[PDB]
Ligand binder design. Sequence first.
Ligand SMILES: [Ca+2]
Ligand SMILES: [Ca+2]
Ligand SMILES: [Ca+2]
Length: 707
Amino acid sequence: ASPQRGRPRLNAARTTFVGDNGQPLRGPYTSTEWTAAAPYDQIARVKELGFNAVHLYAECFDPRYPAPGSKAPGYAVNEIDKIVERTRELGLYLVITIGNGANNGNHNAQWARDFWKFYAPRYAKETHVLYEIHNEPVAWGPPYSSSTANPPGAVDMEIDVYRIIRTYAPETPVLLFSYAVFGGKGGAAEALKDIRAFNKAVFGNENAVWTNEAVAFHGYAGWQETTIAVEELLKAGYPCFMTEYAGGAWGSGMGGLDVELTYELERLGVSWLTFQYIPPTGVSDDVTKPEYFSALVENSGLSWTPDYGNWPAARGVYGNGGLARETATWINNFLTGTTRIEAEDFDWGGNGVSYYDTDSVNVGGQYRPDEGVDIEKTSDTGGGYNVGWISEGEWLEYTIRVRNPGYYNLSLRVAGISGSRVQVSFGNQDKTGVWELPATGGFQTWTTATRQVFLGAGLQKLRINALSGGFNLNWIELSPISTGTIPDGTYKFLNRANGKTLQEVTGNNSIITADYKGITEQHWKIQHIGGGQYRISSAGRGWNWNWWMGFGTVGWWGTGSSTCFIISPTGDGYYRIVLVGDGTNLQISSGDPSKIEGKAFHGGANQQWAILPVSAPAFPTGLSAVLDSSGNTANLTWNAAPGANSYNVKRSTKSGGPYTTIATNITSTNYTDTGVATGTKYYYVVSAVSNGVETLNSAEAILQYPK
Ligand SMILES: [Ca+2]
Ligand SMILES: [Ca+2]
Ligand SMILES: [Ca+2]
């Protein structure tokens, strides 16, 4: 027989459709709405990414149908046939749906009926194919059945299209509604209305036990709210099916897999279709590119059993009920708590996968006799076991979940006769550098070494890398910092590039950039709530900074994600203001001095902020360093700094410094540096001196050569 897949059926639990092997359907998408069918070659690549399914946005609907000259359904048939044929012979599943195009959150009822009058009987016999009635027919979620739904009548469209499909394809799985925003216990309650209205029409009774149907939903409420809505709906007896979602790594400023929601959907037993495309083309991000899928799975510790290939690797958490270890928690609106991760509870999975050890035997013999890591009993406070026989090159991964991002005290309980080296990365990103661990003088003589780290939010593998041997490891600890990165107080914010401040506007509760006028609207109380996170409130009325559909100010207190801001030091006296939600940094746009925005980390001055006492002197701006013709001379010029008596010109040979002060008492906004060596790069900054008080250094100026 052919490798064509057997018809999906609801699982015993009644949570989703699973394939002919009892496993969830997991896949990316492709479109044939205004483009050719993706080639066999590229659709095949799906199987190497642990996918067994493809989402097809088949055609997009015309609002004007069936007026003269409007595009009818059927126009893409020759390409949709190719996708059906190609997924058939690749042993993949296929979810076919009607796309929206430019008309998002909308549908045409008659276009959809005639779409399924055509396509339903055409693929009825195709066991690997499922029908999802329509992508996001309403703006933007339940209840569709409300008269004030935008637009109304979607439930009637679903009812009509289900009846059309069952006539022409009685065995074929149907995915309903495709709620764009499906969030909260509210979301589930509102969907139940639409589900009950649907069931009363089709089956005659508000509560029907579906044998071959499920609620399709998307992830645009966010992972927390979507998970709550799915849990609730599953409890009411209705299988679900994720058909479109996205997230990305915290701090990337880009899309890709929502790792957090995938983990929750894996736990609840829910099949999913992520919104990354099969090459060559698509409207979002390419699923074959590491940054948008494979690396995100690889960095997080996420695992499932793939239908084809050997990725992802089989792995999991040891202890803690097989669930990623939480790092901190909110207790009286302050981020606190110490999580102890025992070193001998490294993830299971294998040698080369969840740990690397130099041999396959546990020479110590304790705790985990079937694995390669070397474990003995320890005589340290709290008893238990320690990882010993640590050779250089070895490593141990522990899957954790940093629900609250920011600054954490990372602690290693260590013993060793002599010193040793280690390095810790989180999500395959170095957070420590080379960490010199002290000599204790014995192999059960214990001490705690501690180092401060900046963790991003989400599932992430903590990985101890042993750069030297000769130490034993008992446990690891993370707790959020109890003392902040900057003292509590009232401050003025000045952007490093342009010297501008942030100002409250009570009339529309907005925050906008302006020149530091010295007023209370441009003054801000700062209060640390654990983890380097801060509540930032205006001085005049006690209203808190809020990053949500713009950048404004609100009455409710700051423990929710939009009202919380990580103040992250640069190292050179400035800070960047990281947003707790996505990990992007608050910056003024180099391009438009008025526009405030959130972008991913870069070296530029426009992303950096001075958080200063109100009376502190302003730093210089606009520094520009240019080489003079035919000679060793750098001509510096900058803008005059308010209240400056003089300037100090400083120079370094790499970006960021340190900066050796080449000249002081400059009573002018320009300088000529004669001591520049032939054909070498130089980096300049300038500070001002106001009433004996030296300011911060300006933004860096790279020495500019000729064309
Ligand atoms: Ca071993
Ligand atoms: Ca070992
Ligand atoms: Ca231990």
